[PDB]
């Protein structure tokens, strides 16, 4: 019984965690362009 | 033996220059509290500051191709 039942665990562990890989990448990479915008706005301040 | 003519160094000695009618009212004797020189200096300093800051921003933001490849390629390998 535990052949296919455990075989499904591999695909579950891969896909269900690749799911939130994209979530963490979204949470992190969005916090990068805000700094660029802040820097360019400070540059506009200095002129 | 050293000889020369002498003229007395008197306190009564005064010098008499002459002034033209258009002397005192030169435009630069009378100046306001705010002229263009101070703004020029401050504006040039600000321009140099912004020139430095844009370069700093350029070197601070030059990681986008690296900040995206290292986020996308490992997921490609994981799926592949």
PDB file of C-alpha atoms in Angstrom:
ATOM      1  CA  UNK A   1       0.000   0.000   0.000  1.00  0.00           C
ATOM      2  CA  UNK A   2       2.794   2.392   0.981  1.00  0.00           C
ATOM      3  CA  UNK A   3       4.408   2.388  -2.478  1.00  0.00           C
ATOM      4  CA  UNK A   4       2.175   4.837  -4.338  1.00  0.00           C
ATOM      5  CA  UNK A   5       0.986   6.499  -1.127  1.00  0.00           C
ATOM      6  CA  UNK A   6       4.563   7.505  -0.285  1.00  0.00           C
ATOM      7  CA  UNK A   7       5.347   8.140  -3.963  1.00  0.00           C
ATOM      8  CA  UNK A   8       2.783  10.957  -3.988  1.00  0.00           C
ATOM      9  CA  UNK A   9       4.687  12.581  -1.105  1.00  0.00           C
ATOM     10  CA  UNK A  10       7.572  13.450  -3.442  1.00  0.00           C
ATOM     11  CA  UNK A  11       5.368  15.430  -5.825  1.00  0.00           C
ATOM     12  CA  UNK A  12       3.542  17.028  -2.891  1.00  0.00           C
ATOM     13  CA  UNK A  13       6.786  18.154  -1.240  1.00  0.00           C
ATOM     14  CA  UNK A  14       8.132  19.523  -4.520  1.00  0.00           C
ATOM     15  CA  UNK A  15       5.103  21.388  -5.854  1.00  0.00           C
ATOM     16  CA  UNK A  16       3.436  22.613  -2.653  1.00  0.00           C
ATOM     17  CA  UNK A  17       6.724  24.256  -1.597  1.00  0.00           C
ATOM     18  CA  UNK A  18       7.586  25.637  -5.014  1.00  0.00           C
ATOM     19  CA  UNK A  19       4.187  27.275  -4.446  1.00  0.00           C
ATOM     20  CA  UNK A  20       5.457  29.541  -1.668  1.00  0.00           C
ATOM     21  CA  UNK A  21       8.894  29.891  -3.243  1.00  0.00           C
ATOM     22  CA  UNK A  22       7.197  32.383  -5.570  1.00  0.00           C
ATOM     23  CA  UNK A  23       5.475  33.988  -2.570  1.00  0.00           C
ATOM     24  CA  UNK A  24       8.775  34.655  -0.784  1.00  0.00           C
ATOM     25  CA  UNK A  25      10.356  35.914  -4.004  1.00  0.00           C
ATOM     26  CA  UNK A  26       7.410  38.313  -4.367  1.00  0.00           C
ATOM     27  CA  UNK A  27       7.778  39.452  -0.753  1.00  0.00           C
ATOM     28  CA  UNK A  28      11.499  40.099  -1.177  1.00  0.00           C
ATOM     29  CA  UNK A  29      11.945  41.478  -4.723  1.00  0.00           C
ATOM     30  CA  UNK A  30       9.159  44.053  -4.326  1.00  0.00           C
ATOM     31  CA  UNK A  31      11.147  45.532  -1.422  1.00  0.00           C
ATOM     32  CA  UNK A  32      13.971  46.411  -3.841  1.00  0.00           C
ATOM     33  CA  UNK A  33      12.477  48.905  -6.315  1.00  0.00           C
ATOM     34  CA  UNK A  34      11.098  51.006  -3.454  1.00  0.00           C
ATOM     35  CA  UNK A  35      14.675  51.732  -2.371  1.00  0.00           C
ATOM     36  CA  UNK A  36      15.575  52.704  -5.950  1.00  0.00           C
ATOM     37  CA  UNK A  37      12.608  55.082  -6.114  1.00  0.00           C
ATOM     38  CA  UNK A  38      13.588  56.565  -2.747  1.00  0.00           C
ATOM     39  CA  UNK A  39      17.174  57.045  -3.944  1.00  0.00           C
ATOM     40  CA  UNK A  40      16.155  58.764  -7.181  1.00  0.00           C
ATOM     41  CA  UNK A  41      13.708  60.974  -5.274  1.00  0.00           C
ATOM     42  CA  UNK A  42      16.513  62.004  -2.918  1.00  0.00           C
ATOM     43  CA  UNK A  43      18.618  62.756  -6.001  1.00  0.00           C
ATOM     44  CA  UNK A  44      15.779  65.003  -7.185  1.00  0.00           C
ATOM     45  CA  UNK A  45      15.894  66.612  -3.732  1.00  0.00           C
ATOM     46  CA  UNK A  46      19.600  67.383  -4.127  1.00  0.00           C
ATOM     47  CA  UNK A  47      18.629  69.357  -7.235  1.00  0.00           C
TER      48      UNK A  47
ATOM     49  CA  UNK B   1      78.912 111.545   2.190  1.00  0.00           C
ATOM     50  CA  UNK B   2      75.293 111.125   1.124  1.00  0.00           C
ATOM     51  CA  UNK B   3      73.234 114.099  -0.027  1.00  0.00           C
ATOM     52  CA  UNK B   4      69.674 114.580  -1.250  1.00  0.00           C
ATOM     53  CA  UNK B   5      66.815 117.030  -1.027  1.00  0.00           C
ATOM     54  CA  UNK B   6      64.389 116.730   1.886  1.00  0.00           C
ATOM     55  CA  UNK B   7      60.681 117.437   2.308  1.00  0.00           C
ATOM     56  CA  UNK B   8      59.187 117.615   5.797  1.00  0.00           C
ATOM     57  CA  UNK B   9      56.949 114.707   6.840  1.00  0.00           C
ATOM     58  CA  UNK B  10      54.208 116.888   8.287  1.00  0.00           C
ATOM     59  CA  UNK B  11      50.867 115.831   9.723  1.00  0.00           C
ATOM     60  CA  UNK B  12      49.508 118.884   7.884  1.00  0.00           C
ATOM     61  CA  UNK B  13      50.402 117.105   4.621  1.00  0.00           C
ATOM     62  CA  UNK B  14      47.145 116.258   2.855  1.00  0.00           C
ATOM     63  CA  UNK B  15      46.327 114.828  -0.563  1.00  0.00           C
ATOM     64  CA  UNK B  16      43.530 116.206  -2.751  1.00  0.00           C
ATOM     65  CA  UNK B  17      42.000 113.739  -5.213  1.00  0.00           C
ATOM     66  CA  UNK B  18      39.035 114.612  -7.412  1.00  0.00           C
ATOM     67  CA  UNK B  19      35.832 112.642  -7.768  1.00  0.00           C
ATOM     68  CA  UNK B  20      33.520 112.539 -10.798  1.00  0.00           C
ATOM     69  CA  UNK B  21      29.789 113.144 -10.651  1.00  0.00           C
ATOM     70  CA  UNK B  22      29.074 109.453 -11.319  1.00  0.00           C
ATOM     71  CA  UNK B  23      31.331 107.963  -8.638  1.00  0.00           C
ATOM     72  CA  UNK B  24      29.422 106.928  -5.525  1.00  0.00           C
ATOM     73  CA  UNK B  25      26.241 105.547  -7.115  1.00  0.00           C
ATOM     74  CA  UNK B  26      27.912 102.633  -8.687  1.00  0.00           C
ATOM     75  CA  UNK B  27      25.425  99.743  -8.715  1.00  0.00           C
ATOM     76  CA  UNK B  28      27.551  97.488  -6.498  1.00  0.00           C
ATOM     77  CA  UNK B  29      28.056  99.864  -3.548  1.00  0.00           C
ATOM     78  CA  UNK B  30      24.321  99.582  -2.783  1.00  0.00           C
ATOM     79  CA  UNK B  31      23.312  95.941  -2.627  1.00  0.00           C
ATOM     80  CA  UNK B  32      20.264  94.093  -1.257  1.00  0.00           C
ATOM     81  CA  UNK B  33      20.218  91.405   1.407  1.00  0.00           C
ATOM     82  CA  UNK B  34      19.821  88.726  -1.296  1.00  0.00           C
ATOM     83  CA  UNK B  35      21.857  88.695  -4.510  1.00  0.00           C
ATOM     84  CA  UNK B  36      22.526  86.071  -7.153  1.00  0.00           C
ATOM     85  CA  UNK B  37      25.978  85.038  -5.877  1.00  0.00           C
ATOM     86  CA  UNK B  38      24.748  83.174  -2.784  1.00  0.00           C
ATOM     87  CA  UNK B  39      22.104  81.338  -4.811  1.00  0.00           C
ATOM     88  CA  UNK B  40      24.766  80.482  -7.407  1.00  0.00           C
ATOM     89  CA  UNK B  41      27.053  78.976  -4.768  1.00  0.00           C
ATOM     90  CA  UNK B  42      24.286  77.033  -3.011  1.00  0.00           C
ATOM     91  CA  UNK B  43      22.830  75.805  -6.319  1.00  0.00           C
ATOM     92  CA  UNK B  44      26.230  74.635  -7.578  1.00  0.00           C
ATOM     93  CA  UNK B  45      26.825  72.782  -4.308  1.00  0.00           C
ATOM     94  CA  UNK B  46      23.399  71.149  -4.628  1.00  0.00           C
ATOM     95  CA  UNK B  47      24.136  70.225  -8.249  1.00  0.00           C
ATOM     96  CA  UNK B  48      27.389  68.536  -7.223  1.00  0.00           C
ATOM     97  CA  UNK B  49      25.570  66.729  -4.400  1.00  0.00           C
ATOM     98  CA  UNK B  50      22.946  65.433  -6.833  1.00  0.00           C
ATOM     99  CA  UNK B  51      25.681  64.415  -9.279  1.00  0.00           C
ATOM    100  CA  UNK B  52      27.266  62.304  -6.547  1.00  0.00           C
ATOM    101  CA  UNK B  53      23.904  60.905  -5.430  1.00  0.00           C
ATOM    102  CA  UNK B  54      22.873  59.783  -8.916  1.00  0.00           C
ATOM    103  CA  UNK B  55      26.130  57.831  -9.241  1.00  0.00           C
ATOM    104  CA  UNK B  56      25.563  56.322  -5.793  1.00  0.00           C
ATOM    105  CA  UNK B  57      22.052  55.298  -6.847  1.00  0.00           C
ATOM    106  CA  UNK B  58      23.445  53.838 -10.075  1.00  0.00           C
ATOM    107  CA  UNK B  59      25.914  51.666  -8.169  1.00  0.00           C
ATOM    108  CA  UNK B  60      23.278  50.785  -5.549  1.00  0.00           C
ATOM    109  CA  UNK B  61      20.685  49.718  -8.140  1.00  0.00           C
ATOM    110  CA  UNK B  62      22.961  47.860 -10.582  1.00  0.00           C
ATOM    111  CA  UNK B  63      22.029  44.435  -9.096  1.00  0.00           C
ATOM    112  CA  UNK B  64      18.673  43.918 -10.859  1.00  0.00           C
ATOM    113  CA  UNK B  65      20.001  41.395 -13.444  1.00  0.00           C
ATOM    114  CA  UNK B  66      21.671  39.578 -10.548  1.00  0.00           C
ATOM    115  CA  UNK B  67      18.715  40.066  -8.172  1.00  0.00           C
ATOM    116  CA  UNK B  68      16.405  38.407 -10.720  1.00  0.00           C
ATOM    117  CA  UNK B  69      18.564  35.626 -12.220  1.00  0.00           C
ATOM    118  CA  UNK B  70      19.338  34.159  -8.792  1.00  0.00           C
ATOM    119  CA  UNK B  71      15.596  34.212  -8.039  1.00  0.00           C
ATOM    120  CA  UNK B  72      14.425  32.639 -11.321  1.00  0.00           C
ATOM    121  CA  UNK B  73      17.110  30.180 -12.485  1.00  0.00           C
ATOM    122  CA  UNK B  74      17.154  27.974  -9.323  1.00  0.00           C
ATOM    123  CA  UNK B  75      13.378  27.539  -9.626  1.00  0.00           C
ATOM    124  CA  UNK B  76      13.928  26.595 -13.274  1.00  0.00           C
ATOM    125  CA  UNK B  77      16.427  23.919 -12.229  1.00  0.00           C
ATOM    126  CA  UNK B  78      14.139  22.672  -9.444  1.00  0.00           C
ATOM    127  CA  UNK B  79      11.232  22.245 -11.856  1.00  0.00           C
ATOM    128  CA  UNK B  80      13.500  20.858 -14.598  1.00  0.00           C
TER     129      UNK B  80
END
